Amino acid sequence: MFERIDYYAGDPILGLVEKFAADNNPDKVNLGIGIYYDESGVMPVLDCVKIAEQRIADPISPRPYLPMAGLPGHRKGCQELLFGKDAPVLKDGLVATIATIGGSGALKVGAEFIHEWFPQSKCYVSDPTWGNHIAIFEGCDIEVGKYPYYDTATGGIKFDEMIAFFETLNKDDVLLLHPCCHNPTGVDLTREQWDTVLNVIQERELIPFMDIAYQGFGEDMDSDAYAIRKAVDMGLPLFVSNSFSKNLSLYGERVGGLSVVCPTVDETERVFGQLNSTVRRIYSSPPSHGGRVVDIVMNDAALHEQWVGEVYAMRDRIKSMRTKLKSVLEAKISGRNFDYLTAQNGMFSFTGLTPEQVERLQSEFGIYMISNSRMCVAGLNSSNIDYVANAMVDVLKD
Amino acid sequence: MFERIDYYAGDPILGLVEKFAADNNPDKVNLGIGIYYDESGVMPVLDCVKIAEQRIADPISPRPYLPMAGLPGHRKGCQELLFGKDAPVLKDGLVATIATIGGSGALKVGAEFIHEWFPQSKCYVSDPTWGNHIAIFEGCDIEVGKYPYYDTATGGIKFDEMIAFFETLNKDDVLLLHPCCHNPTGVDLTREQWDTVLNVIQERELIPFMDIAYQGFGEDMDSDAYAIRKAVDMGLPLFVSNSFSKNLSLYGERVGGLSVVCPTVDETERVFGQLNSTVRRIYSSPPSHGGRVVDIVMNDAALHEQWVGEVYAMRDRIKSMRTKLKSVLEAKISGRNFDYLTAQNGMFSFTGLTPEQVERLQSEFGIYMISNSRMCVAGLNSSNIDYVANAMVDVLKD
Ligand SMILES: Cc1ncc(COP(=O)(O)O)c(C=O)c1O
Ligand SMILES: *Cc1c(COP(=O)(O)O)cnc(C)c1O
Ligand SMILES: O=C(O)[C@@H](O)Cc1ccccc1
Ligand SMILES: O=C(O)[C@@H](O)Cc1ccccc1
Ligand SMILES: [Mg+2]
């Protein structure tokens, strides 16, 4: 009966974590997953969240269906965070926003909308990009190519080729952009660079789709959303898929939003409708618990202030781990320059190791990174940072 | 830019519920949505759930991603409920199970898997069925038809006619079947009738997709799964989408499951694999809270036992309401037989009122039913029972 059914290779990341989890090396460290850990190496329960969740259990309440859009609190929360507290675009009401099943869910609802209403639109992702970016869009029958982003030699963006690619693209083609914290490279666009990408986007009449999963981990909430707030002011139409998984440390509850920026208030009334429609045929409505935590935190002034604070802290620890790594490498290896490590943003570092080098850190050390060299800086703490840095030196000297 | 986008109308049930909210009428009653309400007309928090949630709140824990297939306890939870604890089929390891974003999430993943691997398969739903059933399958670009089911003149099933229709479908065509508690009519197949349906399905080699959203509201957990369990013995390739929304009274948390019964261990691995692949490409992972509630309630024997009793309570309450409705209507109306009301099962009832008659109930009484006559019996309690039946009498008398 199910002879035709093909085996799954697994999520390429989770294929690695599986190898790690069923490997019993004493010294093993996992730096191959986009999860934030603290100094003890454990996943933090944020204080603001802990408060949100105690409000929820006091008392345990009946659990009706959330609106398909999710709770308005969630919906406002996303908007004020992405665009600005009482921002002009929001004042206008030119942004359609739903709660989604994390960032993933937001991209899916977004992607489906695009497949249906713009069948002729192709989608383009960075070279390289996150794995699920391609899978989600292709899963909608969207044809997916890649724009050149990362330059192997410099270790920065291949900007000249990139803008040139964008010229060769048709009206309504979809550009899957990372406003900050590039996954997996860590190499972000400069604020001047964004203005160049966007002005081409306005001219070439293209569609910008922005995937911001790590707001508050680049520079800060407001700075990280620069690409978002600019495109808006340029009057451009734009899709914004946001995630609270990392910055809220709530991966499990599947919290996130999709926001769509429209020329008109009426056009927004239409888009919002089709978003609910798209949700209806997928999962019907977002989960209550997750929705409530977002609502509580984003809308409680004190809790919100407290939240921005703890994200600042997480960001800072990462920035700090980037420094210590650069320190130990520059000290023990006189030859190469490792400024890219502290130049890169958010949770990821393309450590610029060859696929053979990444292999070596795995066999002898129990140090896991992706074949393309991506490393989650958040996997590093005082207690293990020493070991990893030396191992990288040893693999670099080889 | 989005001028190609047409307005959504809204979910028709939600349009009816919305209409109910804005009603002036002091005595308005909502019988239009398939939510269980207790003898007071409030959504209940199950005691077993209260206990689970407080276990989750003590202490509040880190929130890592659930496996794509959800927690193993949630899966074991589902499998045991549907197929029966220590089912041969479960012992053989021949069911691929994932946690899903409610029943809707199970239907979606299910449909998407079918669209992928059986592109020529068409899907047939019962006439009539739950509105949202079509949306999901059409939402996958699967062509959807209607197999004859409910007979209007008799108020039963056009069974003879149905079986012949099934003889006319192609290999691997998909039948969406309500094992019990048919939404929206409440008219169910007898155990005999089910053997014939499954025999044809076997012979024509059709795919039976069972959507069970009300397990324990028909007769009981075992009886309601009879179609599921018979299907299994016959060696049929079964798809079961189970919702916990209603029986676990946890709609908001989006708890359900999807299970695929396979000939071999290897086919189960391939299918399990692809089920993950599908989940990854949609939303990545199911929500942590709802999953944990399910895991806790199902796999704690004292809680499982308590849960089951609390469902049967709800079942028994619905049942008394049917009895009382029949009683009152038979008292004040002659030339009609009201045994169909007690002949039906679960939360829904095709009450046999004309579209105009439903219209009069809303207009003067604020009694809200679907135009096709579906009534959620679970919106009836001793406080409104007399009011509703009398209103039904008035509308029927003329
Ligand atoms: C680059 C990127 N974008 C978006 C997401 C959204 O995923 P989630 O469902 O956890 O929000 C992720 C998650 O890892 C990601 O890595
Ligand atoms: C409610 C329901 C489902 C599942 O809907 P969810 O809210 O996602 O759990 C499936 N089938 C029927 C007939 C239903 O009434
Ligand atoms: O970029 C990363 O490394 C994470 O997105 C990986 C991941 C996402 C979702 C689920 C499991 C794993
Ligand atoms: O059949 C019904 O109407 C409800 O049981 C389920 C539902 C109602 C409204 C919206 C979504 C889902
Ligand atoms: Mg499709």
What is the SS3 assignment for chain A? CCCCCCCCCCCHHHHHHHHHHCCCCCCCEECCCCCCCCCCCCCCCCHHHHHHHHHHCCCCCCCCCCCCCCCHHHHHHHHHHHHCCCCHHHHHCCEEEEEEEHHHHHHHHHHHHHHHHCCCCCEEEEECCCHHHHHHHHCCCCCEEEEECECCCCCCECHHHHHHHHHCCCCCCEEEECCCCCCCCCCCCCHHHHHHHHHHHHHCCCEEEEEECCCCCCCCHHHHCHHHHHHHHCCCCEEEEEECCCCCCCHHHCEEEEEEECCCHHHHHHHHHHHHHHHHCCCCCCCHHHHHHHHHHHHCHHHHHHHHHHHHHHHHHHHHHHHHHHHHHHHHCCCCCCHHHHHCCCCEEECCCCHHHHHHHHHHHCEECCCCCEEEHHHCCHHHHHHHHHHHHHHHHC
Q: What is the Cα–Cα distance from B231 to B198, expressed in whole angstroms?
A: 6
Compute CA distances B23 → A256, B353, B388, whole Å. 34, 22, 17
Q: What is the Cα–Cα distance from B339 to B322, expressed in whole angstroms?
A: 10
Question: Is there a contact between A6 and B101 if contact means CB atoms under 8 Å apart?
Answer: no
Q: Looking at ligand 2, which residue's alpha carbon is closest to its atom 15?
A: B213
Q: Closest Cα to residue A113, out of A200, A227, A207, A243?
A: A207
Cβ distance B97 to B239 under 8 Å? no
Q: Closest Cα to residue A48, out of A397, A250, A358, A297?
A: A297
Q: What is the Cα–Cα distance from B239 to B241, expressed in whole angstroms?
A: 7
Are residue A37 and residue A77 in the same domain, yes or no? no
User: By the CB < 8 Å criterion, does B171 face chain A?
Assistant: no
**Annotated active-site residue in A158, A188, A194, A211:** A211
- B124-136 burial, b if ≥16 CB within 10 A, otherwise e? bbbbbbbbbbbbb
Q: What is the Cα–Cα distance from B179 to B333, expressed in whole angstroms?
A: 33
User: By the CB < 8 Å criterion, does A133 face chain B?
Assistant: no
B117 classed as catalytic? no
Look up residue A119 and give its amino acid.
Answer: P
Q: What is the Cα–Cα distance from B120 to B137, expressed in whole angstroms?
A: 13
Are residue B141 and residue B33 in the same domain, yes or no? no
Q: For residue B137, count CB atoms less than 10 angstroms from its CB and return exposed for 0-12, middle for 13-18, buried for 19 or more.
A: buried
Q: Closest Cα to residue B375, out of B7, B137, B34, B135?
A: B34
Q: Closest Cα to residue A65, out of B321, B11, B182?
A: B11
Are residue A155 and residue A30 in the same domain, yes or no? no
Cβ distance B90 to B254 under 8 Å? no
Question: Is there a contact between A252 and B49 if contact means CB atoms under 8 Å apart?
Answer: no
Residue to substitute in B130, B134, B137, B246 for testing ligand 2 pocket (most ligand atoms within 8 angstroms of CB)? B130
User: By the CB < 8 Å criterion, does B17 face chain A?
Assistant: no
Q: What is the whole-number distance in angstroms between the Cα of residue A17 and the centre of ligand 1?
A: 16
Cβ of B33 below 6 Å from ligand 4: yes
Residue A330 has which token pair?
């520059």
Protein residues placing their CB within 5 Å of the ion ligand 5? B 141
Nearest to B288 among A64, A253, A291 (CB): A253
Q: What is the Cα–Cα distance from A262 to A270, expressed in whole angstroms?
A: 10
Q: Closest Cα to residue A243, out of A180, A337, A321, A303?
A: A180
| Phi, then psi, of B77 in degrees rounded to 5 | -45, -60
Question: Is there a contact between A1 and B45 if contact means CB atoms under 8 Å apart?
Answer: no
Look up residue A63 and give its amino acid.
Answer: R
Please give the angle made by the CA atoms of B84, B86 and B91, to the nearest 5 degrees.
120
Q: For residue B115, count CB atoms less than 10 angstroms from its CB and return exposed for 0-12, middle for 13-18, buried for 19 or more.
A: middle
Q: What is the whole-number distance in angstroms between the Cα of residue B270 and the centre of ligand 4?
A: 33
Q: What is the whole-number distance in angstroms between the Cα of residue A65 and the centre of ligand 2?
A: 11
| Phi, then psi, of B105 in degrees rounded to 5 | -60, -40
A139 annotated ligand binder: no
Number of separate domains in chain A = 2
A-B Cβ pairs (cutoff 8 Å, strict)? 220
Place of tokens 């964008």: A166
Compute CA distances A190 → A73, A200, A206, A279, A307, whole Å. 32, 16, 20, 35, 27
Place of tokens 């009301």: B341
Are residue A289 and residue A329 in the same domain, yes or no? no
Are residue A25 and residue A81 in the same domain, yes or no? no
Nearest to B283 among A8, A117, A283 (CB): A283
Cβ distance A144 to A114 under 8 Å? no
Which of B:74-103 have CB within 8 Å of A?
A: 101-102
Are residue B132 and residue B65 in the same domain, yes or no? yes
| Phi, then psi, of B211 in degrees rounded to 5 | -110, 110
Mutant choice from A206, A280, A294, A297 vs B, greatest count of B C-beta within 10 A: A280
Resolution, Å (one decimal): 2.5
- Among candidate residues A282, A300, A318, the one where a domain is terminated: A300
Look up residue B105 and give its amino acid.
Answer: G
Q: What is the Cα–Cα distance from B136 to B54, expressed in whole angstroms?
A: 35
Q: Closest Cα to residue B315, out of B288, B283, B345, B339?
A: B345
Task: Determine the 3-state secondary structure of B81 from DSSP.
Answer: helix
Q: Closest Cα to residue B157, out of B181, B201, B184, B187?
A: B187
Nearest to A43 among B50, B64, B102 (CB): B64
Q: What is the Cα–Cα distance from B166 to B173, expressed in whole angstroms?
A: 9
Question: Is there a contact between A253 and B43 if contact means CB atoms under 8 Å apart?
Answer: no
Task: Determine the 3-state secondary structure of B328 from DSSP.
Answer: helix
Are residue B296 and residue B307 in the same domain, yes or no? no
Angle between helices A288-299 and A72-83 (to 10 degrees): 50
Spell out the residues 6+ positions from residue A31 whose beta carbon is closer than 8 angstroms to its own. A367, A368, A369, A375, A376, A377, A379, A380, A388
Q: What is the Cα–Cα distance from B275 to B109, expressed in whole angstroms?
A: 7
- A83-97 burial, b if ≥16 CB within 10 A, otherwise e? bbeebebbeeebbbb
Cβ distance A370 to A358 under 8 Å? yes
Are residue B13 and residue B129 in the same domain, yes or no? no
Are residue B108 and residue B193 in the same domain, yes or no? yes
Helix, strand, coil share of chain B (percent; to 5): 45, 15, 40
Searching chain A, which residue's CA lies closest to the CA of residue B4?
A: A117
Strands B123-127 and B95-101: unpaired
Are residue B376 and residue B240 in the same domain, yes or no? no
Q: What is the whole-number distance in angstroms between the Cα of residue A61 and the centre of ligand 1?
A: 30
Q: What is the whole-number distance in angstroms between the Cα of residue A126 and the centre of ligand 4?
A: 40
**Annotated active-site residue in A246, A295, A307, A326:** A246
Residues in chain B: 398
Please report residues of A whose CB lies closer than 8 A to that of B269. Answer: 7
Q: What is the Cα–Cα distance from A60 to B51, expressed in whole angstroms?
A: 10
User: By the CB < 8 Å criterion, does B159 face chain A?
Assistant: no
Q: What is the Cα–Cα distance from B202 to B208, expressed in whole angstroms?
A: 9
- The coordinates were experimentally obtained by X-ray
User: By the CB < 8 Å criterion, does A250 face chain B?
Assistant: yes
Are residue B197 and residue B324 in the same domain, yes or no? no
| Phi, then psi, of A208 in degrees rounded to 5 | -90, 125
Q: Closest Cα to residue B29, out of B380, B346, B350?
A: B380
Shortest Cα–Cα distance, A70 to chain B (Å): 10
Q: Residue B351 belongs to what domain range? A: 1-58+301-398
Question: Is there a contact between A284 and B104 if contact means CB atoms under 8 Å apart?
Answer: yes
CA A144 to chain centre: 19
Compute CA distances A182 → A153, A343, A348, A355, A356, whole Å. 18, 12, 7, 20, 23
Nearest to A135 among B3, B102, B280 (CB): B280
DSSP state, B300?
Answer: S
Task: Evaluate the omega torsion of the peptide bond into residue B59 and state whether it is cis, within 30 degrees of 0.
Answer: yes
- Among candidate residues A284, A300, A316, the one where a domain is terminated: A300
DSSP state, B335?
Answer: S
B211 classed as catalytic? yes
User: By the CB < 8 Å criterion, does A106 face chain B?
Assistant: no
A130 classed as catalytic? yes
Strands A367-368 and A29-30: parallel
- Alpha-helical (H) ranges within chain B are 12-21, 47-56, 72-83, 88-91, 102-117, 131-138, 159-166, 191-204, 221-224, 226-233, 265-280, 288-299, 301-332, 340-343, 355-360, 385-397
| Phi, then psi, of A322 in degrees rounded to 5 | -55, -45
Question: Is there a contact between A286 and B139 if contact means CB atoms under 8 Å apart?
Answer: no
Are residue A54 and residue A64 in the same domain, yes or no? no
- Among candidate residues A300, A332, A366, the one where a domain is terminated: A300
Compute CA distances B251 → A106, B54, B99, B212, whole Å. 21, 18, 15, 15
| Phi, then psi, of B146 in degrees rounded to 5 | -120, 120
